């Protein structure tokens, strides 16, 4: 994780990796689904898919290049992968797709084909990907009438109303030098890239700034997509979490590691040192669960997702889980905190120390767009070790104890009690 | 009456029975609640309440 950064108009960011065999170069823009509105929602996803269109890919294939694009909430990415030497061909491609073939990708024949594909994509997702669909609705209700509420894939209604003009409108307002960072990961050197970029010049809509809007807000609420024909009940529940780069960023992630994730069907998962597992395994309250601490620019979500076929005991599932959360405020043990520290480190390692360069590109770009630099793993590990039981209790007393929640669920959710019942479990009685 | 007219035997037994019946009523109230429970309460719309129940 070598932090190499230089500015001369365009902000270049690289990260050399001796052991690699490949390289990835691309551009990451500081705008995502959150920078959209209810009506052009899905525009970014649209751009992602036209950049991956067969036409624009056949070109890159002949040059021995692979195409990648990721649409998130606070950012977007367009990455080109190649061998360690063909790094220059990569730049020729980025220079082409965003300055040359800008029109070829937006042809009537291409746009219509792409629009029809993402339309079918988003539909299959809303029809079949229940856990992600529900997680998406958690964001939709938790942050309603606020930026973070818009699904990254966009909605069907807004998607079929999108036209070529919308792409351009968005592109002119967001694909800008001031809202961009050219990323280079793999084994390519800093100077090798900075010179290959400095070779070409021009500008194409430079010196501009992205539009501003309303501040993200968490609203205690719920959205219920009951469907009695589905075999399970999928639900996500959470409280207002921590925004990226917050004093309690790590404490929140540690807290989520304490309750972790579980998969009823995998032997080792059933043996984890998680207290909650003693309560849910007897009557097999669920097939799986996964805690999370989602972080964004303005806010975050802390909670968990779960799936179950135990439709008559969902109230017990929710009751025991929230009852464990109460513990973070009043009785989390020292050894629970230590187990989380270890497991947190391991996870952050598997994320940042992945062998894949495209991942590092997204991580690098996104991070420098916010804090100017990428967080060194060694500094993260030190902050994680510094965390104490008191730290955890102080955080939970603020974010968890007797706080509003956001709920979302689909399928056989008749057994999921009213908001107030779930809400009451955010605290315990006492003298 | 326990005699020729409402008199001592009557008032005394009436007190004994006054104390007894309220416990019989309590028992019937349990039978009442048992019969209510298997079908649940009705509602002002006179139709099924199964599609929307609250605790």
UniProtKB/Swiss-Prot annotation, chain A:
What name goes with this protein?
A: Cytochrome b-c1 complex subunit 1, mitochondrial
Subunit field text: Component of the ubiquinol-cytochrome c oxidoreductase (cytochrome b-c1 complex, complex III, CIII), a multisubunit enzyme composed of 10 subunits. The complex is composed of 3 respiratory subunits cytochrome b (COB), cytochrome c1 (CYT1) and Rieske protein (RIP1), 2 core protein subunits COR1 and QCR2, and 5 low-molecular weight protein subunits QCR6, QCR7, QCR8, QCR9 and QCR10.
Q: Which organism is it from?
A: Saccharomyces cerevisiae (strain ATCC 204508 / S288c)
UniProt subcellular location: Mitochondrion inner membrane
InterPro entries, per database record: Metalloenz_LuxS/M16, MPP/UQCRC_Complex, Pept_M16_N, Peptidase_M16_C
**Signal sequence range:** none
User: Please, which domain of life does this record's source organism belong to?
Assistant: Eukaryota
Something else the entry says is:
Present with 19300 molecules/cell in log phase SD medium.
Please provide the record's keywords in A-Z order: Electron transport, Membrane, Mitochondrion, Mitochondrion inner membrane, Respiratory chain, Transit peptide, Transport
* GO MF, one annotated term: metal ion binding
Q: Which cysteines are cross-linked by disulfides?
A: none
Q: Does the keyword Calcium apply?
A: no
Quote a single Gene Ontology cellular component term. mitochondrial inner membrane
Predominant place of localization: mitochondrion
Protein family (similarity comment) = Belongs to the peptidase M16 family. UQCRC1/QCR1 subfamily.
Offer one Pfam family short name for this entry. Peptidase_M16_C
Q: What does this protein do?
A: Component of the ubiquinol-cytochrome c oxidoreductase, a multisubunit transmembrane complex that is part of the mitochondrial electron transport chain which drives oxidative phosphorylation.
Topology relative to the membrane: Peripheral membrane protein
Swiss-Prot record, chain B:
Q: Which residues cross the membrane?
A: 8-39
Topological domains annotated Mitochondrial matrix:
40-55
- Annotated binding of heme b b562, by residue: 18
Which residues does the annotation say bind heme b b566? 32
Entry binding sites for a ubiquinone: 37
Record's subcellular location:
Mitochondrion inner membrane
Q: How does it assemble?
A: Component of the ubiquinol-cytochrome c oxidoreductase (cytochrome b-c1 complex, complex III, CIII), a multisubunit enzyme composed of 10 subunits. The complex is composed of 3 respiratory subunits cytochrome b (COB), cytochrome c1 (CYT1) and Rieske protein (RIP1), 2 core protein subunits COR1 and QCR2, and 5 low-molecular weight protein subunits QCR6, QCR7, QCR8, QCR9 and QCR10.
In the record, the note on similarity to other proteins reads: Belongs to the cytochrome b family.
Q: What else is known?
A: Heme 1 (or BL or b562) is low-potential and absorbs at about 562 nm, and heme 2 (or BH or b566) is high-potential and absorbs at about 566 nm.
Its function, per the record, reads: Component of the ubiquinol-cytochrome c oxidoreductase, a multisubunit transmembrane complex that is part of the mitochondrial electron transport chain which drives oxidative phosphorylation.
Supply the name of the protein: Cytochrome b
Q: Which organism is the protein's source?
A: Saccharomyces cerevisiae (strain ATCC 204508 / S288c) (Baker's yeast)
Gene name for this UniProt entry: COB
Q: Give from-to of the shown chain within the full protein.
A: 166 to 220 of 385
